[PDB]
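Researcher: Can you fold this with chloride ion in place?
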Amino acid sequence: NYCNQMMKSRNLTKDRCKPVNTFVHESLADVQAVCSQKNVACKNGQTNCYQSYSTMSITDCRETGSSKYPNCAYKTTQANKHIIVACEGNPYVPVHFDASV
Amino acid sequence: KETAASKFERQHLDS
Ligand SMILES: [Cl-]
Ligand SMILES: [Cl-]
Ligand SMILES: [Cl-]
Ligand SMILES: [Cl-]
Ligand SMILES: [Cl-]
Ligand SMILES: [Cl-]
Ligand SMILES: [Cl-]
Ligand SMILES: [Cl-]
Ligand SMILES: [Cl-]
Ligand SMILES: [Cl-]
Ligand SMILES: [Cl-]
Ligand SMILES: [Cl-]
């Protein structure tokens, strides 16, 4: 499946099984653009989080209950959701994927 | 050495 393939290729399952990961099917520039969209509170108390005006194409990858390194196994869920990112730096760009809504 | 912005792109972007 896509999750197993992309998780491996992107070095999230080569040296562990990362329990959860989200992939966004939008251009890098359109995701970066989120950092000047709607400012929202972060879960951690900071306020450098931003929510996309638009829903975006995303794939959620979540480890199965039986999955165990090295034989990582994922469930793949596809959705169109608003994304929430934490932004930082100069340029002010996404550094953490927080949630999808 | 990968930056935080680099790590986000690798982990999350699949344009
Ligand atoms: Cl990683
Ligand atoms: Cl692991
Ligand atoms: Cl982990
Ligand atoms: Cl994620
Ligand atoms: Cl791109
Ligand atoms: Cl958050
Ligand atoms: Cl909360
Ligand atoms: Cl803050
Ligand atoms: Cl989730
Ligand atoms: Cl959906
Ligand atoms: Cl942060
Ligand atoms: Cl950095």
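Model: Folded with chloride ion in place. The interface with chain A takes residues 4-5, 7-15 of chain B (CB under 8 Å).
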